[PDB]
Amino acid sequence: SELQLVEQRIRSFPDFPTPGVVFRDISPVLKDPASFRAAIGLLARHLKATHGGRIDYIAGLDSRGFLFGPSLAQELGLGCVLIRKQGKLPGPTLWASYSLEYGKAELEIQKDALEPGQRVVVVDDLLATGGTMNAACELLGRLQAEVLECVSLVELTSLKGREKLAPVPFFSLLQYE
Amino acid sequence: SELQLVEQRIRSFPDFPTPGVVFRDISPVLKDPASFRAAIGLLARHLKATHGGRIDYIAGLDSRGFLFGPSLAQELGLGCVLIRKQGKLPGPTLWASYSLEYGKAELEIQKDALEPGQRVVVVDDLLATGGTMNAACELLGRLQAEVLECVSLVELTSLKGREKLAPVPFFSLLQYE
Numbered sequence: 001s002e003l004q005l006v007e008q009r010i011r012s013f014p015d016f017p018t019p020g021v022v023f024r025d026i027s028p029v030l031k032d033p034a035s036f037r038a039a040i041g042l043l044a045r046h047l048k049a050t051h052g053g054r055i056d057y058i059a060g061l062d063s064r065g066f067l068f069g070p071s072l073a074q075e076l077g078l079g080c081v082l083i084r085k086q087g088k089l090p091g092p093t094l095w096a097s098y099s100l101e102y103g104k105a106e107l108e109i110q111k112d113a114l115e116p117g118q119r120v121v122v123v124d125d126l127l128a129t130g131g132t133m134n135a136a137c138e139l140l141g142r143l144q145a146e147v148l149e150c151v152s153l154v155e156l157t158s159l160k161g162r163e164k165l166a167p168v169p170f171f172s173l174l175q176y177e
Numbered sequence: 178s179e180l181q182l183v184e185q186r187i188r189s190f191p192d193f194p195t196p197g198v199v200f201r202d203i204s205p206v207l208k209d210p211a212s213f214r215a216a217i218g219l220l221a222r223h224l225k226a227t228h229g230g231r232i233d234y235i236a237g238l239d240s241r242g243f244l245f246g247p248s249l250a251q252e253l254g255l256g257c258v259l260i261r262k263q264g265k266l267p268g269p270t271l272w273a274s275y276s277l278e279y280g281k282a283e284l285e286i287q288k289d290a291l292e293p294g295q296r297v298v299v300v301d302d303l304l305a306t307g308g309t310m311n312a313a314c315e316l317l318g319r320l321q322a323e324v325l326e327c328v329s330l331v332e333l334t335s336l337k338g339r340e341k342l343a344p345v346p347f348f349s350l351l352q353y354e
């Protein structure tokens with residue numbers, strides 16, 4: 001199956017970047033053409049079956065979300081907008097600087113990236129605490145854009161990222177502790 | 178034409194990130210589905226006509242190169258390997274830390290990213306001084322990989338990035354001063 005091709009392309013690294021943390025690496029997905037295609041296809045088919053043609057843009061998150069954003073957008077015949085780490089984008093920007101318990105979620109977006117009312121789906125490689133995607137949703141909301149859903153390849157369920165994103169819908173391909 | 182669709186989707190910002198520097202933003206290319214597709218198509222057709230089927234992988238550069246790497250690889254039916262900013266990748270890595278006159282080129286790659294003899298094409302959004310791509314080429318060389326060519330959407334010719342990359346071939350879609 002398609003999901004199998006993604007399932008077998010996740011590599012785990014203990015104690016990275018800090019002790020006690022298991023890093024989930026999506027590199028083998030990118031390196032395997034069939035796996036990357038399967039991952040994009042699964043995400044696209046979910047979004048199309050869920051939102052139909054009401055999605056205006058895909059928003060990819062700096063930096064690993066950039067790996068999936070464009071391809072997912074292209075599959076849906078949509079454009080891709082950028083949400084970057086702070087200090088990276090030119091022109092007027094909105095900032096979202098969050099200080100959570102175990103890290104910082106600090107993003108930015110150009111003020112002219114979206115028009116009010118436009119509907120967007122956010123994509124990153126992995127959802128953990130949800131601090132990053134929540135910060136992205138805040139930026140989009142302040143542009144008066146509508147966030148239809150957030151999606152990722154990997155979800156760490158024990159970190160309760162889904163509850164944090166609520167009521168914004170979320171979907172992941174693979175779930176780990 | 179296809180090139181026209183890319184030509185009309187580059188935005189310039191004066192004095193970013195520092196005074197005297199004109200920032201070339203490829204964001205409109207990503208936001209326009211036809212433009213992004215045209216850009217990928219032009220790069221792919223060049224690489225296929227130049228290297229045939231001798232390319233094993235595409236290497237995308239953190240972070241804006243991640244926007245084009247996967248799609249370019251998929252178009253050529255190839256996998257995409259990652260070259261990241263330092264401290265981002267898990268496992269054993271090689272580092273390339275360069276201090277040029279007007280900036281730093283500091284990248285890293287996993288030691289198991291490539292096998293000796295494998296042939297790779299490097300992609301980023303823009304070539305300036307060439308310090309970044311040269312650092313990438315160094316990393317690949319130390320893995321005993323062969324760099325067939327480096328490609329980008331935009332090239333700033335007055336900064337002489339091409340001469341720096343020599344004898345490694347280079348190709349860009351758009352050239353500015």
Ligand SMILES: Nc1ncnc2c1ncn2[C@@H]1O[C@H](COP(=O)(O)O)[C@@H](O)[C@H]1O
Nearest residue numbers: 022023024125126127128129130131132
């Ligand atoms: N255990 C992990 N393995 C790989 N990436 C992670 C991990 N935990 C958090 N991240 C990254 O952190 C960002 C989101 O985390 P969070 O804000 O906690 O949901 C994304 O860039 C994720 O890829």
Ligand SMILES: Nc1ncnc2c1ncn2[C@@H]1O[C@H](COP(=O)(O)O)[C@@H](O)[C@H]1O
Nearest residue numbers: 199200201302303304305306307308309
């Ligand atoms: N004028 C510019 N506009 C947009 N990106 C730039 C510019 N100059 C350098 N860069 C970025 O710097 C990196 C390569 O620069 P360089 O190492 O000097 O060839 C890439 O990430 C480029 O996108």
